[PDB]
Amino acid sequence: MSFETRFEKMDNLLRDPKSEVNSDCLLDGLDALVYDLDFPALRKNKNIDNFLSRYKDTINKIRDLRMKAEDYEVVKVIGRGAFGEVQLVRHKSTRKVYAMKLLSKFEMIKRSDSAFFWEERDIMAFANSPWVVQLFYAFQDDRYLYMVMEYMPGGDLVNLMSNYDVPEKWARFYTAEVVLALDAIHSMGFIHRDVKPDNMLLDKSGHLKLADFGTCMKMNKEGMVRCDTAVGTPDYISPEVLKSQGGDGYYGRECDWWSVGVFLYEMLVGDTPFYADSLVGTYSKIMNHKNSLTFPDDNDISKEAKNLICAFLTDREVRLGRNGVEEIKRHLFFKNDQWAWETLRDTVAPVVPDLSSDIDTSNFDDLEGEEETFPIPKAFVGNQLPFVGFTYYSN
Template sequence: MESARCWFSKFRSKDKARPSKKKEVSSNGKEGIKAPSSEELPSNVTKQRVAAAKQYIENHYKKQMKDLQERRERRDMLEKKLADAEVTEEEQSNLIKYLEKKETEFMRLQRHKMGADDFEPLTMIGKGAFGEVRICKEKSTGHVYAMKKLKKSEMLRRGQEQLQHWQRNRRMLAYSTVGTPDYIAPEVLLKKGYGMECDWWSLGAIMYEMLVGYPPFYSDEPMSTCRKIVNWKTHLKFPEEARLSPDAKDLICRLLCNVELRLGTKGAHEIKAHPWFKGVEWEKLYQMKAAFIPEVNDELDTQNFEKFDEDDSQMQTPNKSGPWRKMLSSKDINFVGYTYKNFEIVNDHQLPGIGNILSCSCVNI
């Protein structure tokens, strides 16, 4: 009896050591595959990479189909315009070949991996929480652009902080996420639900700043600004030294007020009809000479932009692009599909549109 027990215990220990091939029986009596253990499940990083790969592949083929459709539309549009014009068959053939050549150049340009190293950074014309805007010159062509460089790590970090802040204190979110709240309407801050009327409040705040020199509810602390906006009846005041006309004060007061009384709720015509705009010919606005025309000496002239302190660390940051760039990281997953290139945007320099193509043969359509 003891020997049988000893043999049975050895048999059970071997059976436990052997990988289990048992099948689970479901409630309806059918056999099914045993659910994987927690150790066999993919990690969150793997799931993120799978989702990013799926999104990348879907975007890739969607973009291919969209690009093909756009090429066909450009070809059809050109053929239609040529058919309506008095153009010889030889000229039609030459223009179509020219378009095909430019389409090929555009497809080659789309495959080009462009990075910050392809540009010569010049003057900084803008700076924000996530990056900077700088005038730059493309090294290969010499064309001048405005380049916005964003720090992905900073965007993700701040997004994470805001999420945690939301979870800790929802009430404070209205004060912490607005950034510059000088022009935000009180109904937005109080989360009462709002519509387009809040834009007319912003117009009143901007008008006040342009006439007085500073925002109507300015404070060094954003939270204090928000409190002033919510209690606007107490804090909306006009300094005597600004010398605002009665009509200007009236228009500002009718914009910075309760939403149900705010000018513009029935349409922009209410604001246009205000006495402060008397004499303005709205229909001829684009034909009128501007009150102030900025002086621009050349394409690199930045005298009309705000001056910013240069940060050498940002200027010398290496840009990792090309074949030596590391594979998709967890940070990059949040930015899959952000690349955008447009046929018409590079039109002026390399890829003439239909109008330019036709002008090459002096065809007037």
């Protein structure tokens, strides 16, 4: 409350990589102001014109120095999606190899939803868990948002499952790491919402990390979230998150445990338990899990694996994990000899990636519409404002 304390408090607020007003967010704010005002229509205003004239030389210097997309050499497009694409890239100067998620600022504004990336940035940047893919640098430009993360050369669980008939001992491993990776996110106060094999990545050692925190939400004072959002491909989604079509309720971290059952069922049975041709067909079967969940006759599935799946594929009220992680960990399906929960990431993985080089992309299938841009505004529309403060740098 003293004068110096007020100065120091403000000075450290500019240095904090978690602050809303650090030098990177502050710069982002100016960079946006220049992007959204520089139009002939708006420049007819002297306040606007003189401002833009004054900061021209400077804003350009900043633009050149600050991290830019041209500082990375793209090696392969190792992933795609609605709004963006992931790409194996190499930093031209440092020579370091990374995975970079691009997100079109145009599309996110056209199709709304432009707040999902906020939890994706914070989780990866501040998590500090060997269970979460790490964000090194987040930066933007008039067209996209960029996330420079650690490259996972082992591929995703989708690829693994597609190449092996997963034995129970491997499934017990991959599930345990998911239980731990999920518990970490929960410990950070987040619900993943869409846990699936596509989001389970393998490091050089063959150990798991969760990725694609796009669907994440921060839990309230009672460890709960609420949404009016529509979810695509409901295969891994829980009956609660589906009954939430319009904010028609709340749900806790037990929604992530449902998806784990779906992941265990898939690795051992070979298919998703509620699969149907149409999306509406999948939804109907999830709602009717009581009667739709069935197992095949080839009892290549143990008594305890069948039990864990059914303990996870039940209504929230009696779902395993409603009373915390320790009741999942204590399950007989996890009873083994090879590992101990507290040292599982130090154990030797079932599948160890044998890799050719630093840029080995063998586990990632290669990838093959023109760029749509924001129109010239007649008035101030401030298209850049929803992304002010996205820029992150690690020291």
